[PDB]
Design an enzyme around this catalytic site. Structure first.
Site, PDB file in Angstrom:
ATOM      1  N   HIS B  41       0.819  -1.210   0.000  1.00  0.00           N
ATOM      2  CA  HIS B  41       0.000   0.000   0.000  1.00  0.00           C
ATOM      3  C   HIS B  41       0.861   1.272   0.000  1.00  0.00           C
ATOM      4  CE1 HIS B  41       0.246   0.339   4.596  1.00  0.00           C
ATOM      5  NE2 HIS B  41       0.217   1.622   4.258  1.00  0.00           N
ATOM      6  N   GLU B  55      19.913   5.230   7.692  1.00  0.00           N
ATOM      7  CA  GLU B  55      19.276   6.446   8.193  1.00  0.00           C
ATOM      8  C   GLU B  55      19.010   6.328   9.681  1.00  0.00           C
ATOM      9  OE1 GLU B  55      18.920   9.521   8.241  1.00  0.00           O
ATOM     10  OE2 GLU B  55      17.697   9.869   6.471  1.00  0.00           O
ATOM     11  N   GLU B  62      24.247  11.934   9.125  1.00  0.00           N
ATOM     12  CA  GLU B  62      25.024  11.041   9.990  1.00  0.00           C
ATOM     13  C   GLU B  62      26.286  10.522   9.277  1.00  0.00           C
ATOM     14  OE1 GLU B  62      20.989   9.925  10.380  1.00  0.00           O
ATOM     15  OE2 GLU B  62      21.668  11.962  10.646  1.00  0.00           O
ATOM     16  N   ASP B  89      -0.427  -7.434   1.858  1.00  0.00           N
ATOM     17  CA  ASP B  89       0.158  -6.078   1.853  1.00  0.00           C
ATOM     18  C   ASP B  89       1.663  -6.152   2.001  1.00  0.00           C
ATOM     19  OD1 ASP B  89       0.436  -3.372   1.819  1.00  0.00           O
ATOM     20  OD2 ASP B  89      -0.442  -3.017   3.821  1.00  0.00           O
ATOM     21  N   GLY B 183       2.756   6.192   8.581  1.00  0.00           N
ATOM     22  CA  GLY B 183       4.147   6.410   8.206  1.00  0.00           C
ATOM     23  C   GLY B 183       5.062   5.251   8.533  1.00  0.00           C
ATOM     24  N   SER B 185       4.212   2.049   7.948  1.00  0.00           N
ATOM     25  CA  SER B 185       3.944   0.939   7.056  1.00  0.00           C
ATOM     26  C   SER B 185       5.131   0.528   6.258  1.00  0.00           C
ATOM     27  CB  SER B 185       2.890   1.283   6.054  1.00  0.00           C
ATOM     28  OG  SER B 185       1.641   1.417   6.714  1.00  0.00           O
ATOM     29  N   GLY B 186       5.278  -0.783   6.046  1.00  0.00           N
ATOM     30  CA  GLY B 186       6.368  -1.316   5.237  1.00  0.00           C
ATOM     31  C   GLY B 186       7.582  -1.645   6.060  1.00  0.00           C
TER      32      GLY B 186
END
Ligand SMILES: *C[C@@](*)(O)[C@H](CCCNC(N)=[NH2+])NC(=O)[C@@H]1CCCN1C(=O)[C@H](N)Cc1ccccc1
Ligand SMILES: [Ca+2]
Lengths: 51, 235
Positions: B41, B55, B62, B89, B183, B185-186
């Protein structure tokens, strides 16, 4: 493999005569004790190495 | 992530963030130097996306970050067979150039179907991301993480009017207050097995965030590990 995963650190499969064969995921090698998994590459998956 | 805490640098070196028409809109996990696993999604459309591995703080530098372009997107072939169910998903992203693995950029392990499910049923996993830290609130600057308990299927089912398929599981706390959120998700749901982390879920959907009586819903990765392995082969 019934109890404590055959004492395999990662993966266990039932062989024959009550005994086990352990194995490891990609980037690791079955250690000589035939149970534990040791890194076989410099940055194996799933490992924190920053300290 | 609501109710979590700041990660240390390099604590989740498989975590990536996705950027596109929205910054930091979803997370993902490193499968290998060329492939990310995320939620389908997050990547409907063929709109362009970048991935940043290594990150930590998305407003600071960094000098651990590795930015890559996404050149190919493979949503699971059964995603969106049925509208608005969020079944299946899960999606894979191919990067234009390989990541360089190091202490800040490291893949997540992926077991076979049997062991991914055994690891899930150990019942405690870590979720992480730069999503909202309050329901309807601001996104995180520093990567957040949270341990969530697995929730039993019947409790899972009673908690919502929406359908929970066998390609999903519930995780969170009976009292609420701690959850993944918009935010996130995944990003990964991972299970630590004697110091080695395995991918056990993908952050997928919920109802609001961190509400008592509600749980986070996760894509059940054990059902997809054969597909992940098939599509991400390096040669
Ligand atoms: C894309 C992801 O960032 C996000 C993750 C939300 C996780 N929530 C919790 N509580 N762990 N997922 C979504 O936004 C998915 C896909 C689009 C819809 N969606 C939802 O989570 C909606 N909140 C589901 C919904 C609930 C009630 C009414 C309408 C939709
Ligand atoms: Ca940064």
């Amino acid at each position: 493999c019934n109890i404590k995963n055959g004492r395999c650190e990662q993966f266990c499969k039932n062989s024959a005569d009550n005994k086990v064969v352990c194995s490891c995921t990609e980037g690791y090698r079955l250690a000589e004790n035939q149970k534990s998994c040791e890194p076989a590459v410099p940055f194996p998956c799933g490992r924190v190495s920053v300290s | 992530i609501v109710g979590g805490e700041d990660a240390k640098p390099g604590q989740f070196p498989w975590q990536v963030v996705l950027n596109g028409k929205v910054d930091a809109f979803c997370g993902g996990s490193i499968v290998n130097e060329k492939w990310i696993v995320t939620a389908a999604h997050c990547v409907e459309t063929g709109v362009k996306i970048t991935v940043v591995a290594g990150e930590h703080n998305i407003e600071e530098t960094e000098h651990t970050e590795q930015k890559r372009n996404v050149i190919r997107i493979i949503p699971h072939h059964n995603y969106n067979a049925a509208i608005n169910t969020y079944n299946h998903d899960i999606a894979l992203l191919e990067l234009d150039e390989p990541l360089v693995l190091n202490s800040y950029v490291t893949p997540i392990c992926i077991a076979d179907k049997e062991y991914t499910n055994i690891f899930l049923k150990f019942g405690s996993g870590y979720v992480s991301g730069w999503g909202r830290v309050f329901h309807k609130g601001r996104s995180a600057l520093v990567l957040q993480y949270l341990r969530v308990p697995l929730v039993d299927r019947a409790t899972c089912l009673r908690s919502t009017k929406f359908t929970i398929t066998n390609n999903m599981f519930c995780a969170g706390f009976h009292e609420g207050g701690r959850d993944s959120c918009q935010g996130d998700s995944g990003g990964p749901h991972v299970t630590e097995v004697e110091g080695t982390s395995f991918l056990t879920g993908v952050i997928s959907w919920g109802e609001e965030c961190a509400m008592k009586g509600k749980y986070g819903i996760y894509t059940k990765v054990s059902r997809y590990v054969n597909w992940i392995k098939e599509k991400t082969k390096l040669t």
